Amino acid sequence: FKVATPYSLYVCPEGQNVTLTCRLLGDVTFYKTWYRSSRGEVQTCSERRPIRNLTFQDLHLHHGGHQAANTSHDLAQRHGLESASDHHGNFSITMRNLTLLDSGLYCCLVVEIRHHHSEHRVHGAMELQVQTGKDAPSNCVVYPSSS
Numbered sequence: 001f002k003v004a005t006p007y008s009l010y011v012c013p014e015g016q017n018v019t020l021t022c023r024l025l026g027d028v029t030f031y032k033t034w035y036r037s038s039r040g041e042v043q044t045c046s047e048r049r050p051i052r053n054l055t056f057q058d059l060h061l062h063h064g065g066h067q068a069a070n071t072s073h074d075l076a077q078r079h080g081l082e083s084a085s086d087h088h089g090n091f092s093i094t095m096r097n098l099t100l101l102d103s104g105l106y107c108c109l110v111v112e113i114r115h116h117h118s119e120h121r122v123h124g125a126m127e128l129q130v131q132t133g134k135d136a137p138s139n140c141v142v143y144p145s146s147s
């Protein structure tokens with residue numbers, strides 16, 4: 001049971017939209033959320049820092065394997081953040097109108113809860129650099145995670 005991050009680096013200009021993506025390979029509930037963190041030597045995605053004033057708890061989803069889930073219209077409208085899990089193990093966070101305060105190390109956490117004492121936690125890490133200089137790209141440049 002594991003998480004694939006297609007892309008480890010996203011380099012976007014201010015004012016763009018970006019979707020950060022994690023993909024799930026593998027009844028049971030899932031807890032899935034997003035937070036900014038840091039890339040430690042032995043542990044990455046431990047510390048849970050806010051994304052634009054919201055926390056992993058605000059952005060979290062809780063859904064069954066036959067189920068999709070997304071954050072509310074009022075969250076999207078108010079914070080320009082949409083977190084969404086489709087039926088195909090695609091888990092994403094869509095950020096509207098990037099500012100330089102959006103840069104950071106983003107983590108998707110996915111918890112498989114098979115039972116009260118049976119939780120498996122997996123995370124994916126990806127950097128978002130929001131650029132502001134004359135050389136900033138016209139839209140997101142993205143760097144694959146692998147091969």
Ligand SMILES: *[C@@H]1O[C@H](CO)[C@@H](O)[C@H](O)[C@H]1NC(C)=O
Nearest residue numbers: 014015016017018095096097
């Ligand atoms: C970002 O997304 C919204 C759709 O919610 C759209 O109105 C806007 O044109 C988009 N901005 C860019 C730069 O694509």
